[PDB]
Amino acid sequence: DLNDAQLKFANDVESRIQRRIEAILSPIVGNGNVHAQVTAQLDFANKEQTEEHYSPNGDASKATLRSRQLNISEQVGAGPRSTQRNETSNYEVDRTIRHTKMNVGDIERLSVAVVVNYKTLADGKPLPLTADQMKQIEDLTREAMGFSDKRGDTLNVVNSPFSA
Amino acid sequence: DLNDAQLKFANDVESRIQRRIEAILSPIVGNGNVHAQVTAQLDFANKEQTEEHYSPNGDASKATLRSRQLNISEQVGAGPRSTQRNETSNYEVDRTIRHTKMNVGDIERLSVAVVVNYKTLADGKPLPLTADQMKQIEDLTREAMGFSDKRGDTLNVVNSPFSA
Amino acid sequence: IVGNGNVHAQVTAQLDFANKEQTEEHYSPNGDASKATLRSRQLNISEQVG
């Protein structure tokens, strides 16, 4: 029931990422000379979070006060000195409440496998690509897939001649 | 259901960013001599936040007072001196409450992949572009995509001859 | 790359069909006086040197 809807959601996301990669990889490598497939680890767990933050007021310069009683006594007779300080302070503090409801269906970790073809010249020899072109393909695929390191995304692009 | 609506929202945003990039990249590079694709990491999490800020009043110059009782006693007999100061102060403080409801569907991180063609002169030789022109294309794409560093936007523009 | 029919794969999946509900509470430490937020503080100090 709901599981099938989630699976179809994942399939559509993967297909659209695949198409976005293919769109940029087509003009330079050529139609059919590139194949990519995407798998997506998604987030279907309902989470609700409330965050409370208090600004520190331990420093007297940023401390906000409402009432303060400072009783000071010094009975000098060091000799028979007698110092007494009774201090009472009531503070008002900064407060920030944030309520967050995470979206259901977010992407947790995306791994993408891309395979490119060789280059057959007018003679027909399948000449492999170069390192610079491979790096360009890797960068383009990283851009298309929305590659990020916080998610833990992995990308692998290899070059090999396609079968007949 | 709602996930499909969010996905269509993302697709429309990406398509419009793509079209905006293409619009400026067309007059100089030429029709079809430029291809770009956009992916958008969006924000579909409902957040509500209330912020409270208190202006500090620790300095006597900016401190606002309502009532103040200052009892001072000095019984000089340092000898048998006896100083006593009882101070009570009630303050009124500046207060700022901000209530914020973040919009659903905002952009978190935008990464854009752009590929340009080579230059075929009247002879037909695919002459590659220059560094200055590449820098101009990068700047134009950054302007079109709304490039920002707080979001974490990444842009990659590479030059390569298009396939037939 | 390998060719049609020149590759066969089968997948088995160990799945999670157990309903779990979790509530997490976190308190920021306030043992350091620099990050400690205060509402009221009474400090009575007495020194009777003889």
């Binding site: 409402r66 009432s67 009683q69 009472t88 009531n90 | 103040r68 009570t88 | 509402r39 009474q42």
Partner: peptide, 17 residues
């Protein structure tokens, strides 16, 4: 004489001497 102001519950009331 002037009892310090108590904004909430945690706030400590003025201490006499």
């Amino acid at each position: 004489g002037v009892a310090l102001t108590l904004t909430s519950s945690h706030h400590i009331p003025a201490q006499a001497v």
